[PDB]
Amino acid sequence: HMEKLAKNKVISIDAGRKYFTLNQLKRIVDKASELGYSDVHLLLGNDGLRFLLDDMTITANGKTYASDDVKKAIIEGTKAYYDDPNGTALTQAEVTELIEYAKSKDIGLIPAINSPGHMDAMLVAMEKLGIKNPQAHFDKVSKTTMDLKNEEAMNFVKALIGKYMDFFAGKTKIFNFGTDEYANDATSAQGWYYLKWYQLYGKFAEYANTLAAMAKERGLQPMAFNDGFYYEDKDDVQFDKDVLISYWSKGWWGYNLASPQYLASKGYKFLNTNGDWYYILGQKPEDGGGFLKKAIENTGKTPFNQLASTKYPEVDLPTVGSMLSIWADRPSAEYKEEEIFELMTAFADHNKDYFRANYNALREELAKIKESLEALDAAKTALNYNLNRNKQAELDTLVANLKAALQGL
Ligand SMILES: [Mg+2]
Ligand SMILES: [Mg+2]
Ligand SMILES: [Mg+2]
Ligand SMILES: [Mg+2]
Ligand SMILES: [Mg+2]
């Protein structure tokens, strides 16, 4: 059916907290293409900022920050969060190659540059560039979140995100600006309650609305996590309606995030990023949370269309697709490719009607191209590009016929 295959099947990789090589990411892309995924969600800004453009010149606050100054500041900020021995940041040439490599396998890339929360690297970077006190300050000075009242910091980050958006414009369909937290380290995980207390929640919305307008103007579909949108189902503060919502959870006790029902009533489309499918690198059964055993179990237990805090199909809210997420909460933990591959395969195997068939063997065979020309032409026409994961044997036969016609030219 066209509807199921039209939906997004996304694997999310936390390459913000932890470094991934181009080859590691290429191998994730190829495995995603094999299993029938449509997109790779790649966090590049998440705590650490692990992506540098060739030109990092920034214009904000009536002055310009030299490209080499910005690069050096960001590298110092990212190493300040976590000095990864595997590497610090991906280059423009590496990300450009990754986008083109993914495109050749019908895989989209969804970049994520997080703010105002989860931006440890940007905060230190701004300090090195002469921007004093960029951090939010509540129970203590945050190490993760920008102060919304600091114009100097706000103007720089907007300009910085703009430059990242300029690069992804015309290369990717979607840009994720995050907005998933506000100084949870400085509020005992009560960032939204603190924004409300200090009447700065209107200022948060203004920042999120700006980022959404920045994405749309540059031809990018705006994307954000649900956390900041219409907190506690209240609408005295309005948000941009065009944002694709990465819904992952309704929160916990004292963390009253908007329900999927309420956000759906505002007209929001969801990318189902259910927290049930979460795997944090190195997480074990005794730690609780997103360990590998539970994540693999949940790919079967939690329905593809089930939004967090809802029972499916009882509550059936329209989604554009689903996203399984890999996190690197402690980036020092070892990335084991096969663990991610097993979790990716499990999600595809439980949902064979949503995921497409493996078209890698078919692409290899087409790269190798007078009753002989009639036979080759007939097998080429017989090819079916619309087969899901349930029909691999059906596709394999069609590829085998193309092989027989090609070996008899
Ligand atoms: Mg302090
Ligand atoms: Mg307010
Ligand atoms: Mg739009
Ligand atoms: Mg998920
Ligand atoms: Mg490692």
Of 137, 139, 17, the closest CA to residue 84 belongs to 17
Do 167 and 227 reside in the same domain of the chain? yes
In order of 186, 251, 375, the CA distances from 258 in angstroms are 22, 9, 59
Q: Rounded CA gap, 215 and 165, in Å? A: 7
Distance CA 180, CA 295 (A): 21
* Same domain for 340 and 288: yes
Q: Are residues 59 and 114 in the same domain?
A: yes
Residue 353 carries which side chain, given as an amino acid letter?
D
**302 CA → ligand 4 middle, Å:** 10
Do 263 and 368 reside in the same domain of the chain? no
Token pair in block for residue 160: 């910085």
Closest-lying ligand to the alpha carbon of 280?
Answer: 4
Phi, psi of 321 (to 5 degrees): 155, -165
Residue 20 CA to ligand 5 center (angstroms) comes to: 8
- Indicate which CATH number applies to the domain containing 391: 1.20.1270.90
Residue 48: other Cβ atoms inside 10 A: 32
Return d(Cα 36, Cα 359) in angstroms, integer: 9
Last residue of a domain, one of 319, 337, 355: 355
Residues 70, 63: Cα–Cα separation, whole Å: 13
For position 273, which CATH number holds? 3.20.20.80
Resolution (A): 2.2
Amino acid at 68: D
**Whether 370 and 336 share a structural domain:** no
Method: X-ray
Q: Which domain holds residue 365?
A: 356-409
> How many structural domains does the chain have?
2
Q: Beta-carbon neighbour count of residue 338 at 10 Å?
A: 7
Which ligand minimizes its atom distance to the CA of 347?
Answer: 4
Last residue of a domain, one of 309, 330, 355: 355
Same domain, 360 and 350: no
Query: Domain check: are 349 and 377 in the same one?
Result: no
Residues 285, 376 share a domain:
no
CA dihedral 325, 157, 252, 224 (to 10 degrees): -50
Ligand nearest to the CA of 323: 4
Assess whether 180 and 284 both reside in one domain.
Answer: yes
Based on the fold, state whether residues 220 and 342 are members of the same structural domain.
yes
327 & 369 share domain: no
Residue 50 tokens read as 């692990």
Between the CA of 49 and the centroid of ligand 5 the distance, in Å, is 17
User: How much distance in Å is there from the Cα of 141 to the middle of ligand 1?
Assistant: 4
Measure 4 CA to ligand 4 centroid, in angstroms.
18
CA of 143 to the centre of ligand 1 (A): 9
Are residues 246 and 304 part of one domain?
A: yes
Ligand nearest to the CA of 307: 4
What is the 3-state secondary structure of the chain?
CHHHHHCEEEEEEECCCCCCCHHHHHHHHHHHHHHCCCEEEEEEEECEECECCCCCCEEECCEEECHHHHHHHHHHHHHHHCCCCCCCCECHHHHHHHHHHHHCCCCEEEEEEEECCCCHHHHHHHHHCCCCCCEEECCCEEEEEECCCCHHHHHHHHHHHHHHHHHHECCECEEEEECCCCCHHHCCCCHHHHHHHCCCHHHHHHHHHHHHHHHHHCCCEEEEECCCCCHHHCCCCCCCCCCEEEECCCCCCCCCCCCHHHHHHCCCCEEECCHHHCEECCCCHHHCCCCHHHHHHHHHHCCCCCCCCCCCCCCCCCEEEEEEEEECCCCCCCCCHHHHHHHHHHHHHCCCCCCECCCHHHHHHHCCCCHHHHHHHHHHHCCCCCCEHHHHHHHHHHHHHHHHHHCCC
Distance from the alpha carbon of residue 278 to the mean position of ligand 3, in angstroms: 27
CA distance 9 to 304: 10
